[PDB]
């Protein structure tokens, strides 16, 4: 715990006693396993005294020890970070980003990273204190690998969050810096840079265009094939978010030859990679007919159909979307091709899952196939739906009829209408 | 429905009939403004209203990068 002389020395008037005391407090908070954060902040005036030492530009070591002490306090719970912010440390920490001492700079970054990473409230506050310009300056002027890592990680904390997301105008200027950082070889650097890009590309297509405008797509696609999962996984997330954009934006990713990478990642030994590869492809097959065709030419669908019937369920869900989206936007020849790969059977098998959302997705893909079958039956006067028989063979009709016992009204109403429209006696 | 309505609705999944839990219906020209992952009713054809969502899905239903938002400096 604390001592009385610690308190009395901390408020002395000589730098010798101050620096020694702050170092004692720093050592206490820099100790495992359970740091005495409360005891330090509960002790009156202490937090304010640490903050006051950040202004001591004449004493480099005092600033360093002070920043470190506050850093470990801001690493705790939300209330513990509240005390540091309300002590007024944030605007001072931002000034210390342009400290002439590198050891003071880096610890300022770390502190601000911890503060911003507390909540969306703290994040927006840090951004409102204009951290971005000094931080990006520090990042581009850095000469140490440990400094850049901390800066990027802090930057990624400024981007993280969706409830609410940060004001895009206050975070988007970091995109050119982030773009250049993708060319580094450091795994830790690439990882946080790709996470920051995935945060920024997570939303409306305006935000996605800004990400694209910085020219990160080509590099992001190459990083899909990185041997470190700490890099490939966020890189896939960023690419996956970008192809949630419109047809034009999605095409950028495709012209970077992403599909052969995505095909390869469908066979990944890591479970989360296959799922997000499927998720990414599902957002591409939700595109136009040229893009669906691009997925066909990349020989992706035979694998998706294998996944649809045999993979881990949370991976099957995304493959279902991929097949279903393809049946809604595709040409008759494209849908005819999916049917020839045997997509009806594993679609029908999903009609009985307990995830009511995937049931609707399955129902949609089947209805799409059925509607095209009906249109096909009119463009040749046969009046016969060629896919009704295949669905019957796959016990789809029985399963659709069984859905009339499903509690979900949307599913019930849907199954009811399909039977009435395509399977009337 | 019209060619325009059909083309637009290709980017959407029709979840079912009008559900007023999600409020008054959007028009077809407003529908593109719908946030990814959200649901809305939309006016189509001759006064019909259906509930929809974008087929373009955000990364919401996925895993986390929770490690690490905060880092303490030790040793």
From Swiss-Prot, chain A:
| Entry keyword set | Acetylation, Host-virus interaction, Phosphoprotein, Protein transport, Repeat, Transport
Q: Where is this region: NLS binding site (major)?
A: 68-160
The GO cellular component terms are: cytosol; host cell; membrane; NLS-dependent protein nuclear import complex; nucleoplasm; nucleus
Q: Which GO terms describe its biological process?
A: entry of viral genome into host nucleus through nuclear pore complex via importin; maternal process involved in female pregnancy; NLS-bearing protein import into nucleus; positive regulation of cytokine production involved in inflammatory response; positive regulation of transcription by RNA polymerase II; positive regulation of viral life cycle; protein import into nucleus; transcription by RNA polymerase II
Q: Where is this region: NLS binding site (minor)?
A: 237-325
The ARM repeats extend over: 1-36, 37-80, 81-125, 126-164, 165-209, 210-249, 250-291, 292-331, 332-374, 378-423
Q: What's an example of a GO molecular-function annotation for this chain?
A: nuclear localization sequence binding
Segments spanning the bilayer are: none
The free-text tissue note of the record is: Widely expressed.
Residue numbers of Phosphoserine PTMs: 34
Which family does the record assign?
Answer: Belongs to the importin alpha family.
- Tell me how this protein assembles: Interacts with ZIC3. Forms a complex with importin subunit beta-1.
Free-text function comment from the UniProt entry: Functions in nuclear protein import as an adapter protein for nuclear receptor KPNB1. Binds specifically and directly to substrates containing either a simple or bipartite NLS motif. Docking of the importin/substrate complex to the nuclear pore complex (NPC) is mediated by KPNB1 through binding to nucleoporin FxFG repeats and the complex is subsequently translocated through the pore by an energy requiring, Ran-dependent mechanism.
- Protein's UniProt name: Importin subunit alpha-7
Species of origin reads Homo sapiens
Q: Which residues of the full protein are shown?
A: 80 to 504 of 536
From Swiss-Prot, chain B:
Q: Where is this motif: Nuclear localization signal?
A: 54-57
Compartment(s): Virion; Host nucleus; Host mitochondrion
Top-rank taxon, per record: Viruses
Functional note:
Plays an essential role in transcription initiation and cap-stealing mechanism, in which cellular capped pre-mRNAs are used to generate primers for viral transcription. Recognizes and binds the 7-methylguanosine-containing cap of the target pre-RNA which is subsequently cleaved after 10-13 nucleotides by the viral protein PA. Plays a role in the initiation of the viral genome replication and modulates the activity of the ribonucleoprotein (RNP) complex.
Q: Which family does it belong to?
A: Belongs to the influenza viruses PB2 family.
Q: How does it assemble?
A: Influenza RNA polymerase is composed of three subunits: PB1, PB2 and PA. Interacts (via N-terminus) with PB1 (via C-terminus). Interacts with nucleoprotein NP (via N-terminus). Interacts (via N-terminus) with host MAVS (via N-terminus); this interaction inhibits host innate immune response.
Protein's name in the database: Polymerase basic protein 2
Organism encoding this protein: Influenza A virus (strain A/Victoria/3/1975 H3N2)
Taxonomic placement: Viruses, Riboviria, Orthornavirae, Negarnaviricota, Polyploviricotina
What is the gene called? PB2
């Amino acid at each position: 715990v604390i001592t009385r002389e610690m308190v009395e020395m901390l408020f002395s008037d000589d730098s010798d006693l101050q620096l020694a005391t702050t170092q004692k407090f720093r050592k206490l908070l820099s100790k495992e396993p359970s740091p005495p954060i409360d005891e330090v902040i509960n002790t009156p005036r202490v937090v304010d005294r640490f903050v006051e030492f950040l202004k001591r530009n004449e004493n480099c070591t005092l600033q360093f020890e002070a920043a470190w002490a506050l850093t470990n306090i801001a690493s705790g719970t939300s209330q513990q970070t509240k005390i540091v912010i309300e002590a007024g440390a944030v605007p001072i920490f931002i000034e210390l980003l342009n400290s002439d001492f590198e050891d003071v700079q880096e610890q300022a970054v770390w502190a601000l990273g911890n503060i911003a990473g507390d909540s969306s409230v703290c994040r927006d506050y840090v951004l409102n204190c204009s951290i971005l310009n000094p931080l990006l300056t520090l990042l581009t002027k850095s000469t140490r690998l440990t400094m850049t890592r901390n800066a990027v990680w802090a930057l990624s904390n400024l981007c993280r969050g969706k409830n609410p997301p940060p004001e895009f105008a206050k975070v988007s200027p970091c995109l050119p810096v982030l773009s250049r950082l993708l060319f580094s070889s450091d795994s830790d650097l690439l990882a946080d840079a790709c996470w920051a890009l995935s945060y920024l590309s997570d939303g409306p297509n305006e935000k996605i265009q800004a990400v694209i405008d910085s020219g990160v797509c080509r590099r992001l696609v190459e990083l899909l094939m990185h041997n470190d999962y700490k890099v490939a996984s966020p890189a896939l997330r960023a690419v996956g978010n970008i192809v949630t954009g419109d047809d034009i934006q999605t095409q950028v990713i495709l012209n970077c030859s992403a599909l052969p990478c995505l095909l390869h990642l469908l066979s990944s030994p890591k479970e989360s990679i296959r799922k997000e590869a499927c998720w990414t492809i599902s957002n591409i097959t939700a595109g136009n007919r040229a893009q669906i065709q691009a997925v066909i030419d990349a020989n992706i669908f035979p694998v998706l159909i294998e996944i649809l019937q045999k993979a881990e369920f949370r991976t099957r869900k995304e493959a279902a979307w991929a097949i279903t989206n393809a049946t809604s936007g595709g040409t008759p020849e494209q849908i005819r091709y999916l049917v020839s790969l045997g997509c009806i059977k594993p679609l029908c098998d999903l009609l009985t899952v307990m995830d009511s959302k995937i049931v609707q997705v399955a129902l949609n893909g089947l209805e799409n196939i059925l509607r095209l079958g009906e249109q096909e039956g009119k463009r040749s006067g046969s009046g016969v739906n060629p896919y009704c028989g295949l669905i019957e063979e796959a016990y789809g009709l029985d399963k659709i009829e069984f859905l009339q016992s499903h509690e979900n009204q949307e599913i019930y109403q849907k199954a009811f209408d399909l039977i009435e429209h395509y399977f009337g006696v | 429905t019209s060619g325009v309505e059909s083309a637009v609705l290709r980017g959407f999944l029709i979840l079912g009939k009008e559900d007023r839990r999600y409020g008054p219906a959007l028009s077809i020209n407003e529908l593109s403004n719908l946030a990814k992952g959200e649901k809305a009713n939309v006016l189509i054809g001759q006064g019909d209203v259906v509930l929809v969502m974008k087929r373009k899905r955000d990364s919401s239903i996925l895993t986390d990068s929770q490690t690490a938002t905060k880092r303490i400096r030790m040793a």
